[PDB]
């Protein structure tokens, strides 16, 4: 009906533990209170179609695909689950690696973007087709051309050790899990 569901997971399920393990990797002192699997077939189908397209233009390489974090306010959760992340809601300004949506390797970095008035913070785990990346820059509205030739698929803070990714194309992201956690108890 709304085109999506959010399915609360059991903490005894291995699916839960996989998500929790990744969060806990860098926020081990916080307390996960719920994890919901985002179920949106249309966003999944388009993402899988994009991955397929990237595989065809890749020169036989695997498409670089990562589970990355995105901190947001609870107010945006259902919007993201239905329409995907959209960087133009509030816009981008300040320290840019480009005008696109941002994702972090470490949960710990996304904490700062999980605004709350309350003790309960909310963060997404997303499936991101990062592909081939180059360092970002504030003026970028797309990834730049590769040298010669073709374009990069994403931008990062560091080619040698990337921890922040910017995506300019929503078909390269699938919102996977909503993680609710507390900093207290």
- Residue 133, phi then psi, degrees to nearest 5: -125, 155
Q: Where are the alpha helices (DSSP H) in 5-157?
A: 14-24, 41-56, 77-83, 107-111
Cβ proximity to ligand GAB: between 89 and 145 the closer is 89
**Least Å distance between CB 70 and ligand GAB?**
4
Could you tell me if residue 44 is left (phi over 0), alpha (psi between -120 and 50 degrees) or otherwise beta?
alpha
Least CB distance from residue 47 to ligand GAB, whole Å? Answer: 19
Least distance in Å: CB of 114 to ligand GAB?
7
Distance CA 109, CA 27 (A): 9
**Which residue number, 45 or 86, has a Cβ lying nearer to ligand GAB?**
86
Cβ proximity to ligand GAB, 110 vs 172, nearer residue: 110
Decide if 173 contacts 84 (C-beta within 8 A): yes
With respect to ligand GAB, which residue has the nearer C-beta, 32 or 58?
A: 32
Residue closer to ligand GAB, measured from CB, 69 or 181: 69
Residues 15 and 179: beta-carbon distance below 8 Å: no
CB of 53 to ligand GAB, least distance (A): 25
Q: d(Cα 134, Cα 152) in Å, to the nearest integer? A: 7
Q: Can you tell me the distance from the alpha carbon of 127 to that of 34, in angstroms, rounded to the nearest whole number?
A: 19
> Which residues lie near ligand GAB (CB under 6 A)?
69-71, 102-104, 109-110, 113, 164
């Amino acid at each position: 009906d709304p085109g999506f569901q959010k399915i609360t997971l059991s903490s005894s399920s291995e699916e839960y533990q996989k998500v929790w393990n990744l969060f806990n990797r860098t926020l081990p002192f916080y307390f996960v209170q719920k994890i919901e699997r985002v179920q949106n077939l249309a966003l999944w189908e388009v993402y899988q179609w994009q991955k397929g397209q990237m595989q065809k233009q890749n020169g036989g390489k695997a498409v670089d695909e990562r589970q990355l974090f995105h901190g947001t306010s609870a107010i945006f959760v259902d919007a993201i689950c239905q329409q995907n992340f959209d960087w133009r809601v509030c816009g981008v300004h300040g320290t840019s690696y480009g005008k696109g949506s941002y994702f972090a390797r470490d949960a710990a970095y996304s904490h700062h973007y999980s605004k709350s008035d309350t003790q309960t913070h909310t963060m997404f785990l997303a499936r991101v087709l990062v592909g081939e990346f180059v360092r970002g820059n504030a003026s970028f509205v797309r990834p730049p051309a590769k040298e010669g030739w073709a374009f990069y698929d994403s931008c990062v803070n560091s080619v040698s050790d990337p921890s922040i990714f910017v995506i300019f194309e929503k078909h390269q992201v699938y919102p996977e899990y909503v993680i609710q956690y507390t900093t207290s108890s």
